[PDB]
Each structure stands twice: as C-alpha cells, then as structure tokens.
Amino acid sequence: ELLKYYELHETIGTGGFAKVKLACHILTGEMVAIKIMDKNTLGSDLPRIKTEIEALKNLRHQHICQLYHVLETANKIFMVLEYCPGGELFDYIISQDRLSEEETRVVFRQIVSAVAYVHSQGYAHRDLKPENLLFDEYHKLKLIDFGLCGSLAYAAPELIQGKSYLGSEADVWSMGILLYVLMCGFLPFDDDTAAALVAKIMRGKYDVPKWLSPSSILLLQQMLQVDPKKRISMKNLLNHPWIMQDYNYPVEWQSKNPFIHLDDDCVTELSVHHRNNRQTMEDLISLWQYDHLTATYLLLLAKKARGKPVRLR
Numbered sequence: 001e002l003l004k005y006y007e008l009h010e011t012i013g014t015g016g017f018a019k020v021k022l023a024c025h026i027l028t029g030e031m032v033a034i035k036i037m038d039k040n041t042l043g044s045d046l047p048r049i050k051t052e053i054e055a056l057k058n059l060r061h062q063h064i065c066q067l068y069h070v071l072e073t074a075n076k077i078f079m080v081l082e083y084c085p086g087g088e089l090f091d092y093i094i095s096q097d098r099l100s101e102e103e104t105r106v107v108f109r110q111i112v113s114a115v116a117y118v119h120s121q122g123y124a125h126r127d128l129k130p131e132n133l134l135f136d137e138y139h140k141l142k143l144i145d146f147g148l149c150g151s152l153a154y155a156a157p158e159l160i161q162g163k164s165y166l167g168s169e170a171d172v173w174s175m176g177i178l179l180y181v182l183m184c185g186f187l188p189f190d191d192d193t194a195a196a197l198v199a200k201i202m203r204g205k206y207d208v209p210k211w212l213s214p215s216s217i218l219l220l221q222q223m224l225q226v227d228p229k230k231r232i233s234m235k236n237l238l239n240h241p242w243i244m245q246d247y248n249y250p251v252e253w254q255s256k257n258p259f260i261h262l263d264d265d266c267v268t269e270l271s272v273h274h275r276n277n278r279q280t281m282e283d284l285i286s287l288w289q290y291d292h293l294t295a296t297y298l299l300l301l302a303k304k305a306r307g308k309p310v311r312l313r
C-alpha cells in the first residue's frame, strides 16, 4: 500500500521482527530490497530502529548495503535497500563447509574496510555476524542490520559482564569470532546451555583445527584477547602481516564513492522530470529526506554507474 513507487516481487526472508520483499523502482527500473518493519511488533524498541536508520543515512560505503528510501505508514516502516543477489555469508560458508585461507582473507579485508569506515564516522556496529553480511552479483560483501539473542557467541567478554567497553575493541572481538567461523565453519566458543557459553568466552580457550596456518592462529590469538587492552587495535589490523599475506597493500577503508557534490546528469534528468530548474532541483535533493526523490537520485546514480542511460521512463 502507498509505496506504489515500486512493483513488488518475491519474498526473501521473513523474521518475527522484519521481513524482506523484492521490488522494482518504477521510474529508474532498478531492482531493490524492501525491509518491512511492523511498529506493533517493535514497540519498546522503535527509537532503537529510528537511531539505526539515522546512522544508516550518514553511511556511504562500497561494503555497506545502501539505504534508498524510508517510508513510515500508520503501523509499518519500509526501508528501501541495495539489491544483494549473491546471498548471505552464513549460507555461503555452510555450503562450502569452510572457506580457504586465501578466500577468507579476500572477504575479511572487506569486513575490515566496512567496519573501519563506520568507526571513522563515529559509530560502532556492535553486532558483526555472518547473517549481517550479504553478497552482490559481483560477490562483494555488503554490511546490514546495524540494530545495536544468539549474538551471545559473537559477544566480547567485557560486553558479557557489563563492564566499560569500547565499541571498536568489541568490533575487533566480533571480527575474530567471524574470522574463526570463516576458516573453520564452526564457532570457537559454542554451547547448548548459555551459562557454559559465557564460561568459555571468559576462559578464552578455544579449539584450533589442524588445517589452520601459523599466521592465522597468530592473528586469531591477537584478536581474541579477553582483556580489551591486550586486543589488537583497528589501526594495527588494517596493515597486519596476515591481512597483507596475499595482496600486499593495507585495507582501503576510505569511502571510494563519497557523497561530495551532486552528479550533474542525475540532477539534469530530475529537473526535466520534476519540471523545475537546476538550482531549485539541487536544493530539493540536498535536503536528503530519504523520500522518493532521494531514492530516485541514488538509483539514477546506480543506473549511471552501470553505463546505462541516466533516464526515467
């Protein structure tokens, strides 16, 4: 209803919180994903989502899944998001059992990039797990659900015991757990009772498979220090020996597509369409409301990047 700015297609994952519906932006012809939140189901965590959405308006990175449009009806919230055909990182591992060191490295370098960018913008994800890591058609990673139950396995020990934590030192712990599951295909700390799970995280002791290389084991033990003072810093991680073991350059965390100025061709096409001049069109865009204009601009930008003509129907 009312979001007939879009033709609706397939359903690609329902949660008891938010469902995702596939869609097509009428004007641009561009494929999109729609996260459908129900305000009734949220309730005591609506500002949780509003703050999540407000962070997501200020993040423009190649490994962050792009927000196009927010739409809030009487009872529903619609997030219009970058289309990620490739699927989830979680489902990518379970199908390969585990990834090669060389492939984990390729993927890991992308997580580091997305996460470093986020930090530089003065945010921490505070939930890095393979269920938040989507793949595009070019098999590049995109980061989702910035939100902050079964994230207890990926939780930092100082986060567990309600101590004073830094959001980056936590993000580093999470990336250690993720690095483990990438190479092994199972969790380093895992238990049926959640108290014994909490015990193993504090103990800091974990299994090491025979297939793990020494540099791997060594990076893992740098990353899964219980004491946050002892954990590897984000700064030291970008140019780490292991990280640079195949592609001998540090992580390119800097946004490769910054929001700088508005694109000329997009502004001219929106001016002809919305039947007003360049300046009145530019002012209207620069307001960045995450309405249909923001979606049309950002999706015309997408169309331009593909080498398709910068035109609405």
Ligand SMILES: O=C(Nc1ccc2c(c1)CNCC2)c1ccc(F)cc1
Binding pocket: 012, 020, 022, 032, 033, 035, 065, 081, 082, 083, 084, 085, 086, 087, 134, 144, 145
């Ligand atoms: O576009 C998304 N996923 C997607 C799109 C197409 C297909 C899939 C996932 C998986 N089956 C093949 C087709 C997507 C993007 C963002 C998001 F938060 C949730 C889902």
